[PDB]
């Protein structure tokens, strides 16, 4: 008998007021897809964020759109089954850096996807 | 619709 | 960017004939797979433990239990070119029964080697 | 050297 536990952490960043995925992240996303195909029971927790600039409602929608964009790539570009992926936006409520600098805001405009599962 | 920074 | 880890956990069970420490071809396929996974997980290591049923001299069984563990290691090292430094062996004689020694079936189950493979990549 | 059973 044997078991193999899969743990992944994917990080995607976005430009201001955009939810499109840059080409530089595509390879990472392909890697995630590959692992999801190797671990059928694995699921992904995709969470989107925005920096603290702009309207609250706009950022609520944008953060969700960012997580859904990462899921869309996975499902439509990498054949990953949509039923295995969750998405959610947290607006600016969960910053990983200070919004007072352009580097910090750059860091907050992102999507973190945590993949877990065993086979 | 429109963030800035 | 993205971080990724895979944790391996597996157990191999090998059984022996009375007073015998030879690996019966009945378990070669089982062993072949362990070697393959040890290849897939280069950092993986194995804790090989041998046992005996409760019949016979204590010393004979302490040596037999160890001999059984070393037999499985030798299969991996010699037949599967596995690095010996990745495999540890220990004998427990009859101190860790898993079945009833009063029955023929239980003794057969106690004459064993349990190998636990664990690693990451 | 010599288990039985
Ligand atoms: Cl960045
Ligand atoms: Cl058996």
Two structure tokens written together for A62: 């944008």
Q: State the first-to-last Cα distance of chain B, in angstroms, to the nearest integer.
A: 15
Two structure tokens written together for A100: 């007072």
Say how far apart CA A73 and CA A69 lie, in whole Å. Answer: 6
Domain count, chain C: 1
Two structure tokens written together for A49: 């964020």
Say how far apart CA C14 and CA C31 lie, in whole Å. Answer: 9
Looking up residue C59, the CATH number of its domain turns out to be: 3.30.1330.60
Going C52 to C54 to C55 to C59, the CA torsion angle's sign is positive
Do C120 and C75 meet the contact criterion of CB atoms below 8 Å apart?
A: no
Say how far apart CA A92 and CA A111 lie, in whole Å. Answer: 12
Say how far apart CA A36 and CA A74 lie, in whole Å. Answer: 10
Chain D residues whose beta carbon lies within 8 Å of the beta carbon of residue C93: none
Say how far apart CA C8 and CA A90 lie, in whole Å. Answer: 34
Using the Cβ of A53 and the Cβ atoms of chain B, whether some distance falls under 8 Å is answered with yes
How close is the nearest chain C Cα to the Cα of A73, in Å?
A: 16
Cα-only R_g, chain A: 15
CB-based contact C5 A7, cutoff 8 Å? yes
Proportion of chain A in helix, strand, coil states, percent, rounded to 5: 40, 25, 35
Q: Tokens 């299969």, residue?
A: C75
Establish whether chain B is in contact with chain C, requiring a minimum of 3 CB pairs below 8 angstroms. Answer: no
- List residues in chain B that are followed by a break over 2.5 Å (C to N): 2
Do A30 and A14 meet the contact criterion of CB atoms below 8 Å apart?
A: no
DSSP string, A97-112: S-TTSHHHHHHHSEEE
- For residue C50, the enclosing domain spans 1-121
| Structure-determination approach | X-ray
Using the Cβ of A97 and the Cβ atoms of chain B, whether some distance falls under 8 Å is answered with no
Using the Cβ of A35 and the Cβ atoms of chain C, whether some distance falls under 8 Å is answered with yes
Which resolution, in Å, applies to this structure? 2.0
Enumerate residues 6+ apart whose C-beta is below 8 A from A9.
A112, A113, A114, A115, C2, C3, C4
Say how far apart CA A75 and CA C27 lie, in whole Å. Answer: 42
- Counting one residue from C and one from D, how many pairs have CB atoms under 8 Å apart? 20
CA C5 to chain centre: 26
If we measure between CA atoms, which residue out of A96, A30, A98, A9 comes closest to residue A110?
A96
Measure CB to CB from residue C2 to each of A1, A4, A10 and give the nearest one: A10
Say how far apart CA A2 and CA C37 lie, in whole Å. Answer: 10
Do A105 and A15 meet the contact criterion of CB atoms below 8 Å apart?
A: no
Q: Tokens 């009063």, residue?
A: C102
Using the Cβ of C35 and the Cβ atoms of chain A, whether some distance falls under 8 Å is answered with no
């Amino acid at each position: 008998e044997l078991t193999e536990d899969l743990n992944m952490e994917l990080r995607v960043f976005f430009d201001t007021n955009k939810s499109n995925i840059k080409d530089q992240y595509k390879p990472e996303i392909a890697k995630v897809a590959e692992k999801l195909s190797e671990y059928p029971n694995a699921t992904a927790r995709i969470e989107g964020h925005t920096d603290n600039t702009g309207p609250r409602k706009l950022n609520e929608r944008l953060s969700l759109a960012r997580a859904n964009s990462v899921k869309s790539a996975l499902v439509n570009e990498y054949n990953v089954d949509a039923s295995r992926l969750s998405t959610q936006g947290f607006a600016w409520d969960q910053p990983i850096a200070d919004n007072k600098t352009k580097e910090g805001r750059a860091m907050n405009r992102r999507v973190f996807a945590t993949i877990t599962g065993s086979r | 619709a429109x963030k800035x920074x």
